[PDB]
Amino acid sequence: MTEYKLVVVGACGVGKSALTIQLIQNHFVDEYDPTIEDSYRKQVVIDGETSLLDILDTAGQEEYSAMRDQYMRTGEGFLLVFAINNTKSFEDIHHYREQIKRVKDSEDVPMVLVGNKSDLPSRTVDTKQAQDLARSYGIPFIETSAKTRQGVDDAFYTLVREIRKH
Numbered sequence: 001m002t003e004y005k006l007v008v009v010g011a012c013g014v015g016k017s018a019l020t021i022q023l024i025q026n027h028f029v030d031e032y033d034p035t036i037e038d039s040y041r042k043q044v045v046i047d048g049e050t051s052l053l054d055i056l057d058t059a060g061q062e063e064y065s066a067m068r069d070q071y072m073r074t075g076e077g078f079l080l081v082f083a084i085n086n087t088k089s090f091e092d093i094h095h096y097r098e099q100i101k102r103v104k105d106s107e108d109v110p111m112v113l114v115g116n117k118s119d120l121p122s123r124t125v126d127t128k129q130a131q132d133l134a135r136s137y138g139i140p141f142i143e144t145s146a147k148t149r150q151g152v153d154d155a156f157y158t159l160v161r162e163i164r165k166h
């Protein structure tokens, strides 16, 4: 029926792959490969509409440097992923959003802010900070854990709804 091109971005080690592998394969992996950059596919039904998801898991490992802008330009929605124990990954978020906007040539682009690794005890970024950042952009914030699967389906499903709103 419908095809949705999703892109998962965020700093190294936040859990972009872990989140993607959980959605499509329903398991958490003991050793991930940080170099792999590939598109993955998930079929879902949202609002009585079959949806095929073409999920691009970015890792900074493009064949050619020109593919960065092709990823953005061809992507319909973007998952802005940071880790709740990594302050630097949270601060990177505003850099990712501006570049997406810039190369897309648009102010309204479907995005969801995702705070991953909620299961961890040591946290440096609070929900309020992330919610205030998400509100300032006018997008939802969903807290996730790829380890427990908490909020993982809600993250991607909410992004598909945001794309339908565009």
Ligand SMILES: *CCC(=O)N1CC(NC(=O)Cn2cc(C(=O)N3CCc4c(cccc4OC)C3)c3cc(Br)ccc32)C1
Pocket: 007, 009, 010, 011, 012, 013, 016, 034, 035, 058, 059, 060, 068, 071, 072, 092, 095, 096, 099, 100
């Ligand atoms: C563990 C490996 C992994 O998953 N990694 C390494 C990280 N590399 C990237 O995310 C590369 N990348 C950067 C952008 C991007 O548009 N910006 C990066 C941060 C930044 C920007 C502007 C000004 C200053 C900045 O940093 C201070 C914008 C990317 C976009 C896309 Br669609 C893919 C990769 C990518 C992830």
Ligand SMILES: Nc1nc2c(ncn2[C@@H]2O[C@H](COP(=O)(O)OP(=O)(O)O)[C@@H](O)[C@H]2O)c(=O)[nH]1
Pocket: 010, 011, 012, 013, 014, 015, 016, 017, 018, 019, 029, 030, 032, 033, 034, 116, 117, 118, 119, 120, 144, 145, 146, 147, 148
């Ligand atoms: N505790 C916990 N660890 C995670 C979670 N997601 C990813 N990780 C770990 O963080 C590391 C990086 O995950 P990965 O998906 O490779 O990050 P990526 O580089 O953004 O794709 C791995 O060692 C994972 O085990 C999570 O939700 N909870």
Ligand SMILES: [Mg+2]
Pocket: 016, 017, 018, 032, 033, 034, 035, 036, 058, 059
């Ligand atoms: Mg990865």
